[PDB]
């Protein structure tokens, strides 16, 4: 009946243990209040009672000087990352560069690396799709654009805006932590767990400096991602403007050709009316004449041609 | 004759009392000047004479170390919240996380929670409507868009802009309070009411820190709301651009088809003029010939077809 | 020959005296240099030689600890405000809330109140006009918009942009003064006129704090005005986008209907050409037949209808 | 062979001397390095070795406590300003307000006044042209706009953007100098030339304060110029939007009228086809009847009218 | 098997040596960790263990107090710059202005000069192309624009956006270094290599001040580049708006002319229908009359002309 957390616990030795714990039991074990683990804010990093609470959207983590906890990890495709890369990164030959540093450094590096890799993967999925859709859409030899490609571009633009917002909030959180030295000092949970021990254990290694360098690295990576996303948005806008110009130019060409054909039709209809005037079954004084028929036909055709040419010249003058 | 406030008073025990009090009487009771309770600024939080004055649009509140007052609460549908949730939140088993803290913490938490819930409700009402309107409007199989849906989208966009402005001003007020530690210290009215008593009453609990954490929580919630609203605005703009492109593409397709039909009509009218030339009641030298009629009809139809095909090819060349 | 100021002087007792004074004489009386009273900057507030120099566009004022001066007040419709409200506000039962404070507080409050009321009046004039113009323009049942209303909207948008710039510069000046405590202290001219006297005269009343609260009040009012103006601009842009979409949709509907009618005309002209082929005065082998005439007429009409239906179906397929 | 500066030297007495000096000789005389006088940055003000180096685009100046130098003044139309106003401003009855102050104050005031006057002149040239072009272009009674006026507007908009950038960089330089008190102190070259002498020479006059006031004056003037330029840009954008709406409305009106005429033509052609069906030279059973001709003509005309009216009503229903 | 760096080493004497070194060997020689030389961030400047690590996109450099290293220099067309200009700049008569300063000053100046020259070259390539493309596109005498030029403009706009982003990140890095004095002090690697020696070696020359001046120079150059790029973007947007207006105006002119021709055709077809009514082979009572034929023809032509004139007048009234 009581709410519970599905907890994946990684020790300092990289051992992984999955279980479920009551919320009050977790609060008692971690020495934290209920309000600390509400996880109400997406992309939030805080330090409460010497414990690091982190949320990156669906990823909720609690870092202790002794262990790491992942909360609500089910039905999120996190199993591969949790049980394949994390043990190796924390307690193996992974790509982490904070192994000699205390456990919290490795934990923060792993979490930030996973989030930055997720953002990079989203961008690397979105970029080729948007690029090829724009290339198809801005093709100058198409009179009209493909509307299914327009729907695809709209969906990809929505996804790109969401990704850009995620990168922005990640950058904001990292920069807020980096700006204040107090937060950087608080992030060093192992240092403050036993200050007397770490007063001599830290043989010239500044934990705050290492944390600052790690956060600066991840902030720079997120800044590069944000720059790429903004460039993609700008390219999308420019491509949309080019598409508008192409459509307007095609419309103008078709309208000019239709206007020329309308001039031809109007001259043809005028001299056709002139001919039909002689086609009505009313007696005239020109039935007996032999050359009048050919004269009328010739002047009719020649006048149609001349009026069409004059109208074309008038159009050329009007369009300048 | 004198102006009055309709006052809803909540004690430390959660008891609710509704009455009306003269403005001067309220100023005397609260130890505040007339200018303090003007409530001229929407979404303003201030501390005057050890009392917290708050306005969130229509919600005007005065928080004292002993009680809370809601002013001008009538004809605003506030009765349900005032008489159902507030007593439970202040003096019961509500979702407030500041119960062990002094009364002002619970009061501020309740007010900020109500305002943030109002903003979230506005956004959760606006988002599905805007999403479905955009989905209907950006449908690529519609030659023209529904204008009633356009009016609905315009109204919802105005509402979304108003909501975004409200979220922005809420964030600005909260961040202005959070930036300066003096304002955070002033917000702890119970601490400064009896400094001698609270010098020993506060057994290791920092009231300023608790206030900072509460305000940071609500600021983060408002930031998430603002991000969602900005994403909705960006999606609206992108959908409008897609609608423009779709309409232009449909116009281009219809114009091309009309131009092809105009080519057909022009060729038909040209060779029809040629035929009508022989339809006039003028004597010629071809009436006695038998094959001339069928020859003229055949060459007329064939020339119409050939000129139409040539004009279509010319259009294809022009459009590239 | 020498330049002069038309000076309206208000004493501490609210007495008003209008006269003209030579520029050098005014400089000597006020203890100020010529460069101080250039009034080159619109919306500028400064403190020179213990005197407050203020300019709000056409309103130039000099506040002394003993009196207030309005300069160049003629031909600006300022007479009503100068001779009706200002005496009552300074030395009566006006709405000013700084009466117990020294004279400069009342003077600054009156000037800022007049300017904020002018801005509010401009906004309250512009808002209904813009709202009704947009409501008329975004009407979905209009095939075309009213261009006179477009000109009115353009003029009102220019006025709104000017008002927004005025509000922005007012906010900038007030915030620049508020940010630095030195400027706030300098604004208390009565305090620094006789520091020895005011060392004991100020019985617990902080003049700098009162000035800060007054300026914060007026800054918040200006911020609300700026938010309203920005919302109006955003609504104008959204209405323009909606108008564009409505016009494009009407164009598409008219173009589709014209294309259908063009299909009908083309089929009619094709089978009309077929009929005219038999209308020419050339001998054929079908004159004696009786049923051939009705057969040709029937097949002509039926083929016109069938070709029109096929073209309509082709259009439906093309538009998807 | 060696590079040289064309130097115009103004003494403290306003005497002007024009000559040419080798670059190394100028470096030796001014006590400055080669890198100091590169003048690589447009709109840059710096203090090197107690000398003020200023560049405003084409205007390069070096201010010393004893003299002023203008460099590369040829072929820039600077002769009038150099030899007419500068001597009077520096050593006469000019409009400068820093005459009792040391020479560098007058020099800086003259240079900043010239630059601000140049910017004001550019804006006062651009504003009437842009205003009249927009007024001509947004005329609602024009079916189409004048394209030569469009080219003029484009050129003026480019010039306005360049002017706005110049004002922005001028404001940035002035504000960067004003923000740091060290730069303001360094700008007082006469004070630091002989600190022992000026320790008693400055009888209560703060040179840093005077420099701050002068720079604040010029910054406020530049801010007013920037506000005017931004307002002009906003007005240009609004006028462009109004032009777009006007063109779309004219297109819609013309398209509706063309559609009505197309309906008329289609009905006329339908009943004309009906008439032509009886015009073919094929024997029928209605030649002998006398009333059939008039009956057919009457029903033809009446049906044309009725079908045209029905199509117009259908268009009215479709357009809503 | 192990990863290696292709290292180009420049000594203090300008001697160049190209070789390849294992990554671990380079880390040991430079006294740096593996994470220091990841080069994960484009356009990043840092100081680690008294060594300057710089990346400008493809250019990776490590500056030591004794030497400079270029890493991964192959297949980047860097050979000319590496083996022609760098030796002369570092140990010759180059344009560097930091020769008397320690080696790191010359190294930083050379690297920043190369990057700023690359950015200037990119801008000087992009600007004429964009300018000529816009001039061709905004030509008012073209009914339609060239779409190949549109594709060229789109590609150049993408390149310009990339260049603007590069300039922005360069400015951000330089300004981040300049803002904090600690980073400026750290950049002086020779000063901190032997602090005891440089305590007396630096005879009044402040290395931090020289570094600040160099970085300020390069920041100002990058700011000028960014201003030029932003002006180019603004000009591109304005040209696109002008192109839109030109296309709409041409469309309106063509549509008006087509509407006038449609009026003519409609009047011609109406009176042609009137004439054809008399052309059908049905007996009437007007065959014997002689003047009826000419009367009908004359009234037909005159009515066509009059109806066309009336329709033109109606169009003129409608367009206002
Ligand atoms: Cl169009
Ligand atoms: Mg006939
Ligand atoms: Mg359009």
Residue numbers in the entry:
A (entry chain E), B (entry chain A), C (entry chain B), D (entry chain C), E (entry chain D): 82 to 401
Publication passage describing the model:
Molecular dynamics simulations and mitochondrial Mg2+ uptake assays show that the R-ring may function as a charge repulsion barrier, and Cl− may function as a ferry to jointly gate Mg2+ permeation in hMrs2.
The final 3D reconstructions of hMrs2-Mg, hMrs2-rest, hMrs2-lowEDTA and hMrs2-highEDTA were determined at overall resolutions of 2.6 Å, 2.9 Å, 2.5 Å and 2.7 Å, respectively. Of the five ligand-binding sites, three sites (Mg-1, Mg-2 and Cl-1) but not the other two binding sites (Mg-3 and Mg-4) are located in the three other aforementioned hMrs2 structures (hMrs2-rest, hMrs2-lowEDTA and hMrs2-highEDTA). However, at different pH values and after EDTA treatments at different concentrations, all four hMrs2 structures formed symmetric holo-pentamers. Moreover, the four hMrs2 structures were very similar in terms of the pentamer and protomer structures.
